[PDB]
Each structure stands twice: as C-alpha cells, then as structure tokens.
C-alpha cells in the first residue's frame, strides 16, 4: 500500500535523474583528436654557424660544447643546428669527406660523446651539410651529380651513429633543386619518421618558396622572405598574412635568413617585437645564435660579420677591452628582468608549454593602420591575443572582430601576461575597445574559453 | 617633386555634407599615410585622423562622429565627408602628407576654406 | 590627452637678435626605452601653408636653413634663431610627434623691430 508509489516513484526519479546524464554529454561537443607532434614542432630551433666563435679562441671544440648546454637549455630550445664540420678543404672536389671530422672541431668520439649528453636534456643534434662551406659557391660549382652522391651516402653514415635530422643551405646555387630534396627526405623518413631536413633559400620572393613546397610537404624551408619587411615593418602584416595563405596554413619555420642574425635586418628598437611575433606564429622559429641577447655584427670593431664572437661576460672580447659593456653579456642579463635575454626565456617558455602556441589555430582580424594583431586557439584551451605595434607613435588599436569564429571571438577583458616594453602592471585584466598601445609596443593577451 | 593640389574652397548650406579632396603627384599613394588637419583663421591648428592603403582611419574623438575619410586608390586622391555643418566649421582644411606611421607632416597641401552660410 | 603650452604669445625683435620661444608639455615627451625626445615645429608664413622645421625635437627636416636649431628634452622645449633675417616673419607652432590625438600648439607671431 504505502510501500507501492515510493520505491516506484524512486524507480521513476533515479531514471528521471538518468534520462538529463545521458543526453546531456551527448548534446556536448567532444574534443578532436590531437595532431601527432613531432619533436621538432614542440618549440624552437638555435643555429650554431661557427664552433669557434660561439665560446672562443681555441676552446671551439666539441668537447668543450657539453659544459654549454645548461645555459642552451635554460633558453628551452629543442634543437641544435651545428655548423659544417666534415672536412673540406676550399674550392675542391676530391680532398672533401663528409664522414670525417675536421680535427680542429675534434673528433668522432667527441662527437658521439656530444650526443649521448644531449640527449639527456632533450635536445636534439642537427648536423648541416652544406658541402663547400668555405667557398663563395657553396654546393662546388662544376661535377654536381657527385655532390649529391657525397651527401646521399652521408645521409646513411650520420643517421646510424645518431644525429637527429639534417641541414643544407644555399638550395639556390645547385641545379635540380626540387628533386635532389625529394631523394633525402625519403632516406631521412624512411630511416625513422622523426627525422628533419630544413632546407635554406635566400630568394625572398614567394613564387620561388612555393615552388620548393609544392613537392615536399614535409621539410622546413627556411628563407629571407621576411628579410626585406621594410624600414620599420611597413610589410609585415602583408608578408605574414599572405605567406600563410599561399600554403593553405600548413607547418613551416618562421626565421628572418637562413644564417645571419636578427640585428643584420632591423634596428635595435624592433628586437624584443620581432621575438614576440616570432615564437607566436605557426611554426618552429629557427634563431641564430645570439638572438637572444641582442648580439650584433657592427658596433664592435674587428669582427667578421658572418660569424660574430658570442658576449659570455666583460673578458669575453679581449681584443678591444672596453668595447662589451655590463648590459650586453649573457651574464648581464640574466639577472636583469627587463632584459631581453629574458624575454627570450619568458616567450619560449610559453612555446614549449600552452597548447594554443603548439598548435592552434591562426585568424588576423583587422586593426588600425600600423599595427598587427592575431589570435591563437585550440578546442578549449587558453588562447592567446597578441598585439604589435609597429609604428613609432602611440596608437590605440582599434580591434574589429567581425569575421572570426564564434568559437575563438573576443572578451570584453583580458589579463596581459607580458609586455615586451616595461611600463604595464602584468596579470591584471586589460579592456580592450580602450588599448592605446606605446611606440614599438607588443602585449601579449590571454582569455579563457568561456564559449 | 611632391605636388598635393586641392579643390579650393567651397560655399555649403548648413546641415550639408561637404566632400573635400586632396587629389596628389610624385609619390605612390599606397605607401603612405595622409592626414587631416583643420585650422580656423586666427587661431590654433586641430588634427582630423588618417588614412592608408587598406583604407583604415585612426579619427580623433573631438572629430570623430562628424567625419569620415575615404581614399580612392585609382585617381589617387583622398577624400574627407562633413556631416551636419554647424557655423563653428568655417575653417581652413590642409591636407599634409606623413611618412609610414611616425606623425611628421612634412608636405603639407594647399588649403581649402569651408565657409558655412545660408 | 597631451596639452602643449607655447610661453611667449607674441614677441618682436631686430634683424640679428637671437629670438627664442620656449615650450611645455603636460605629460612627458620622452620615451623612456630610447631616450628621443617627440617634439616638432612648424612655421606657418602669414597667407601659406605650414612648414615643417624640426621633427624629433633636434632634427632638422631637408631644405631648411641653419639658423633653426632645436634643443632641450622632458617637458621643457626651446627653438632658436641664431640671426633672425627680413623673411623670417612667421608663426611658429608645436605638435606632439607621439601620441594617438596628436595636439598641436598654441602658436607665437614673431614681428620685425625696424
């Protein structure tokens, strides 16, 4: 009697409390599957051109690398690009062996040695393998077909003693271009498919660099296309915008050359807002050596701009003693929280960890005249608002997002997590229809999803 | 040589739109930023906004609600719209010519005298 | 929003006297990151278009004579005549080379003692 409805109608409401569980994670969207990350899209890329100038006098040698790479992996790269050191004496075919090492870089057992104590910080050894590394003609101007043969059988000999990719640059001075990089990116994948081979160019014009990517799809290529940008960025947002259509937004490094720096291109006011705009871009950015501390082939007298002298401390340039300032070493702004060394490690720190930067998505709204702004997103993790300002005034960015998606749009608040120019209080929201930028300012703007 | 040849002034009923041009030589027009800039006679010079090649303004707040500036990229000239001109708007309207985002209006233009009346 | 400030509203001085006309600023007009100083002065001839002069407080633009040198820094701004000669008669104005609304002087008529 009383026992009938009560336990019935618990047999009714727990099926009432079942019926709104089962369809609600149903009536939710689900994640899409992760993308299969490869080791060398989790962060950046550092080029090491010159051994000997990278530490100094005598100590270039590959032993002495191993005492380096604390410091290299405080900077949180996930590669090492060392520079050509297979013997090759100038200009000449025959007396070139790119299986043995220069014994003035070391020696195959220092070399193994190297790897095996890279591997334990996760860092990633890619061997170059520009055959004439001495001559103005890189790729040794007559009897070509050999060449690629030297490398072809080079591809097999360093790839079972343990490098971990390839590099070759100067593509633009052999003949075959687009074929001879079709034959190694099948030995370098074929081999193992977590195998690298950055190509270099240095036409900066577009129609050479899609002719290089309509074959392979799989290679880095690395180029000066955002080399000529303009005297203070004038064609950034152009050059940046219309590259990542001309591909149809797939992968691809982001470097301003192939071998020189970054002060080689632009004043030293555009260093810190150029290194924002270059870790929050689709792709791997491949930094010279020396990026990171604003390093410069001028301004110091007696210096081969090709391969400049790294600033460790004050006595790292003996030559000229009062030349390297307290402000300019590596050990000078470490400690300096307004540097740019450490801006350098606040930025690839944010590379290698948020998912968005990893591998989300690109979508460049309009702004006022002047200035570059994006967002970043993945399904539902933070996303990611930069803004960049590349006049020498003080603008207000006016954001008209009218075009992007209902899932990536924009909040009426968002908290700055870092500026590239001192001034802002960081972490506390910032409202957006009132930005009012500084000359030569970049801000990096963080929101939830809240979709 | 850079020339920026103007309209010369004009005479406009109250509460009707005025559209002033600032048509331009010796330079592409695409590569730099021109502004606006209003000045009564006898008394301080007023700055209006810009303009580009992708046709974005960057207006000031005492001038925005009233003004609308337009480019034509093919005959190379720009064009400014009044929009319900009150008697405070007899003025003199230049037209200068600033490098790619630094604010120096190095060559100026010409002048063209608004002068509102019924 | 900056405000600028032009001191002497009308001065008058002889052929060779060594004119100067001071400037202020409301808030500072030096970026502290690169330490140049946003100033410019313009010089409008009675019946003409303005003329560019100086642009970043001591840069002289191209095509202007010596005589026009510009100096100081922070909130304090100052344009020299070295020797004022018969043409000179003009009127000298202010911008703000930095900022969003860019606001310009007040002005200051320069007359010839003769």
């Known amino acids: 009697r009383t026992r009938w409805a009560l336990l019935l109608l618990f047999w009714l409401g727990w099926l009432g409390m079942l019926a709104g569980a089962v369809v609600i994670i149903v009536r939710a969207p689900r994640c899409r599957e992760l993308p299969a990350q490869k080791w060398w899209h989790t962060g950046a890329l550092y080029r090491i051109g010159d051994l000997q100038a990278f530490q100094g006098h005598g100590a270039g040698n590959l032993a002495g690398l191993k005492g380096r790479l604390d410091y290299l992996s405080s900077l949180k790269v996930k590669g090492l690009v060392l520079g050509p050191i297979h013997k090759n004496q100038k200009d000449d075919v025959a007396q070139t062996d790119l299986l043995q090492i220069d014994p003035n870089f070391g020696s195959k057992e220092d070399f193994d040695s190297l790897l095996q104590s890279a591997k334990k910080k996760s860092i990633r050894v890619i061997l170059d393998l520009t055959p004439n590394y001495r001559g103005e003609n890189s790729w040794f101007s007559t009897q070509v077909d050999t060449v690629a043969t030297k490398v072809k059988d080079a591809l097999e000999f360093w790839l079972q003693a343990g490098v971990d990719g390839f590099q070759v640059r100067d593509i633009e001075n052999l003949k075959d271009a687009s074929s001879f990089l079709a034959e190694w990116q099948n030995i370098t994948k074929g081999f193992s498919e977590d195998r690298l081979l950055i190509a270099g160019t240095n036409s900066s014009d577009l129609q050479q660099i899609l002719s290089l990517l309509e074959s392979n799809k799989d290679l880095l290529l690395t180029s000066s296309y955002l080399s000529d940008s303009g005297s203070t960025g004038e064609h950034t947002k152009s050059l940046v915008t219309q590259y990542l259509n001309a591909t149809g937004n797939r992968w691809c490094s982001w470097s301003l050359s192939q071998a020189r720096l970054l002060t080689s291109f632009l004043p030293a006011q555009l260093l810190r807002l150029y290194q924002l705009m270059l870790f929050t871009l689709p792709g791997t950015p491949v930094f010279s050596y020396g990026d990171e501390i604003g390093l410069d082939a001028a301004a110091l007298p007696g210096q081969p701009m090709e391969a400049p002298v790294m600033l460790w401390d004050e006595s790292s340039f003996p030559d000229i003693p009062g030349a390297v300032s307290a402000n300019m070493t590596v050990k000078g702004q470490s400690e300096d929280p307004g540097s740019l060394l450490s801006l350098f490690r606040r930025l690839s720190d944010q590379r290698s960890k948020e998912r968005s930067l990893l591998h989300g998505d690109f979508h460049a709204f309009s702004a006022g005249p002047g200035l570059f702004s994006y967002i970043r997103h993945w399904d539902q993790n933070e996303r990611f608002l930069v803004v960049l300002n590349f006049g020498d005034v003080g603008l207000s960015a006016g954001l008209q997002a009218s075009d992007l998606p209902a899932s990536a749009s924009l909040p009426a608040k968002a908290d700055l997590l870092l500026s590239t120019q001192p001034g802002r209080e960081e972490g506390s929201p910032l409202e957006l229809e009132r930005l009012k930028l500084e000359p030569h300012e970049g801000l990096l703007l963080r929101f939830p999803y809240a979709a | 040589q850079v020339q920026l040849k103007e309209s010369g002034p004009g005479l406009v009923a109250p509460s009707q739109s005025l559209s002033i041009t600032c048509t331009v030589s010796?330079?592409?027009?695409?590569?730099?930023?021109x502004x606006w800039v209003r000045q009564p006679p006898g008394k301080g010079l007023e700055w209006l906004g810009?303009?580009?090649?992708?046709?974005?303004?960057?207006?000031?707040?005492?001038?925005?609600?009233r003004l609308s500036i337009s480019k034509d990229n093919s005959k190379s000239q720009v064009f400014l719209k009044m929009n319900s001109l009150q008697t405070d708007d007899t003025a003199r309207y230049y037209c200068?010519?600033?490098?790619?985002?630094?604010?120096?209006?190095?060559?100026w233009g010409q002048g063209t005298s608004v002068t509102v009346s019924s | 929003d900056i405000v600028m400030s032009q001191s002497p509203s009308s001065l008058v001085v002889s052929v060779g006297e060594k004119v100067t006309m001071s400037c202020?600023?409301?808030?500072?007009?030096?970026?502290?990151?690169?330490?140049?100083?946003?100033?410019?002065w313009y010089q409008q001839k009675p019946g003409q278009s303005p003329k560019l002069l100086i642009y970043?407080?001591?840069?002289?633009?191209?095509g202007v004579p010596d005589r026009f040198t510009g100096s100081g820094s922070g909130t304090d701004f100052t344009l020299t005549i070295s020797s004022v000669k018969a043409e000179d008669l003009a009127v000298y104005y202010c911008?703000?080379?930095?900022?969003?609304?860019?606001?310009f002087g007040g002005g200051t008529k320069l007359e010839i003692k003769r």
């Open positions: 200068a010519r600033x490098x790619x985002x630094x604010x120096x209006x190095x060559x």
């Open positions: 010796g330079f592409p027009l695409t590569x730099x930023x």
């Open positions: 303009x580009x090649x992708x046709x974005x303004x």
């Open positions: 808030x500072x007009x030096x970026x502290x990151x690169x330490x140049x100083x946003x």
């Open positions: 970043x407080x001591x």
């Open positions: 911008x703000x080379x930095x900022x969003x609304x860019x606001x």
